[PDB]
Amino acid sequence: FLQINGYAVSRGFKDLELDTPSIEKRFAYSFLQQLIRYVDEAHQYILE
Amino acid sequence: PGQGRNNNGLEIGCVVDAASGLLTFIANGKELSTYYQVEPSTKLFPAVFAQATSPNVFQFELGRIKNVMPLSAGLFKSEHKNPVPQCPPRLHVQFLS
Amino acid sequence: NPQPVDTSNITIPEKLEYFINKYAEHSHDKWSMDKLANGWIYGEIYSDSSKVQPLMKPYKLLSEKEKEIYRWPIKESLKTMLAWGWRIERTREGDSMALYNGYSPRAIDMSNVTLSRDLHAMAEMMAE
Amino acid sequence: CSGGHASNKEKEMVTSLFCKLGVLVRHRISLFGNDATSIVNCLHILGQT
Amino acid sequence: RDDYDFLMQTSTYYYSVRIFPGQEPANVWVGWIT
């Protein structure tokens, strides 16, 4: 009834910011950062 | 008037004058401003272009109005003098493919 | 455990009163439809077996209290869809028709109207 | 051609994974609980990547 | 009440199209093609 009356339902807003250029926005970059973190931690546990 | 009315579906009626070539359209009982004048001996195919927004899109109605002859009386030379609307099996819907 | 969306702080715009209009009317229309199908007749006295009901007077002839409760679920529906934040915009033809401007029950059939895929998703969010 | 390219940053930091895993594997196989073969396979797949 | 003589002497023909409810009318065109 809203549509036939002509009212236009839509989303509350559209995307505020597109982080597409960000390499950090990748799954792979964050996951390999996390490996940097656990591998460096493993290096220092191995030192201990 | 606009919008959707279910007392009757949106009914655009096409009127063709084979003797003058005047193409006039009637929408919901009132004549539209758009009119076309065609050349003599022009063969005109009834046509409807539509994009489907519902399972039921449109319907060809082969009826007649006051003082206007049915489509079969012009399509078929055998029924040239028959005011009763007809849909012989030869008539069928075609689509561009 | 259900915690539905709060709408107490939400408020309606004055533009959607025109939407409440004709839709409370359509609701009264379909109610009259199915009840007259059951046999309900416009008798001011109220009797179930006799099927005499004083409420098939048109939406205009109804009294405001009976106009209430009819609009109530629609009010909560609009307040909810606003609590979802969903922006509602009204086209030019909507304004043009508004400027254009015994009971006869006529029902508006909207079954053949089809919504889009995302629109179906929002309808599902409504239903849930 | 459809896609799926790692960024150059992805690639040098993968090589950095290679460097640290080499540092760990240098002279620590005895300390590792017999998984030295697993480190060998890991640096192998890194070596191809 | 249509005039039989006019119907028999006329060359004007008619067909009509019912756009069903729920079908968006601006997406529907009706007329003639060659």
Swiss-Prot record, chain B:
Location relative to the cell: Sarcoplasmic reticulum membrane
Tissue: Detected in heart muscle (at protein level). Heart muscle, brain (cerebellum and hippocampus) and placenta.
PTM statement from Swiss-Prot or TrEMBL: Channel activity is modulated by phosphorylation. Phosphorylation is increased in failing heart, leading to calcium leaks and increased cytoplasmic Ca(2+) levels.
Induction notes from the record: By TGFB1.
Oligomer status and interactors: Homotetramer. Can also form heterotetramers with RYR1 and RYR3. Interacts with FKBP1A and FKBP1B; these interactions may stabilize the channel in its closed state and prevent Ca(2+) leaks. Interacts with CALM and S100A1; these interactions regulate channel activity. Identified in a complex composed of RYR2, FKBP1B, PKA catalytic subunit, PRKAR2A, AKAP6, and the protein phosphatases PP2A and PP1. Interacts directly with FKBP1B, PKA, PP1 and PP2A. Interacts with SELENON. In cardiac muscles, identified in a complex, composed of FSD2, CMYA5 and RYR2.
Domain remarks in the Swiss-Prot or TrEMBL record: The calcium release channel activity resides in the C-terminal region while the remaining part of the protein resides in the cytoplasm.
Family: Belongs to the ryanodine receptor (TC 1.A.3.1) family. RYR2 subfamily.
Its job: Cytosolic calcium-activated calcium channel that mediates the release of Ca(2+) from the sarcoplasmic reticulum into the cytosol and thereby plays a key role in triggering cardiac muscle contraction. Aberrant channel activation can lead to cardiac arrhythmia. In cardiac myocytes, calcium release is triggered by increased Ca(2+) cytosolic levels due to activation of the L-type calcium channel CACNA1C. The calcium channel activity is modulated by formation of heterotetramers with RYR3. Required for cellular calcium ion homeostasis. Required for embryonic heart development.
Name of protein: Ryanodine receptor 2
Curated annotation (Swiss-Prot), chain D:
Induction: By TGFB1.
Location within or outside the cell: Sarcoplasmic reticulum membrane
Tissues expressing this chain: Detected in heart muscle (at protein level). Heart muscle, brain (cerebellum and hippocampus) and placenta.
Modification note: Channel activity is modulated by phosphorylation. Phosphorylation is increased in failing heart, leading to calcium leaks and increased cytoplasmic Ca(2+) levels.
Family that this chain belongs to: Belongs to the ryanodine receptor (TC 1.A.3.1) family. RYR2 subfamily.
Disease: Ventricular tachycardia, catecholaminergic polymorphic, 1, with or without atrial dysfunction and/or dilated cardiomyopathy: An arrhythmogenic disorder characterized by stress-induced, bidirectional ventricular tachycardia that may degenerate into cardiac arrest and cause sudden death. Patients present with recurrent syncope, seizures, or sudden death after physical activity or emotional stress. CPVT1 inheritance is autosomal dominant.
Self-association and partners: Homotetramer. Can also form heterotetramers with RYR1 and RYR3. Interacts with FKBP1A and FKBP1B; these interactions may stabilize the channel in its closed state and prevent Ca(2+) leaks. Interacts with CALM and S100A1; these interactions regulate channel activity. Identified in a complex composed of RYR2, FKBP1B, PKA catalytic subunit, PRKAR2A, AKAP6, and the protein phosphatases PP2A and PP1. Interacts directly with FKBP1B, PKA, PP1 and PP2A. Interacts with SELENON. In cardiac muscles, identified in a complex, composed of FSD2, CMYA5 and RYR2.
Function: Cytosolic calcium-activated calcium channel that mediates the release of Ca(2+) from the sarcoplasmic reticulum into the cytosol and thereby plays a key role in triggering cardiac muscle contraction. Aberrant channel activation can lead to cardiac arrhythmia. In cardiac myocytes, calcium release is triggered by increased Ca(2+) cytosolic levels due to activation of the L-type calcium channel CACNA1C. The calcium channel activity is modulated by formation of heterotetramers with RYR3. Required for cellular calcium ion homeostasis. Required for embryonic heart development.
Domain notes: The calcium release channel activity resides in the C-terminal region while the remaining part of the protein resides in the cytoplasm.
Protein name: Ryanodine receptor 2
Species of the source: Homo sapiens
Gene: RYR2
Shown residues within the full chain: 2991 to 3039 of 4967
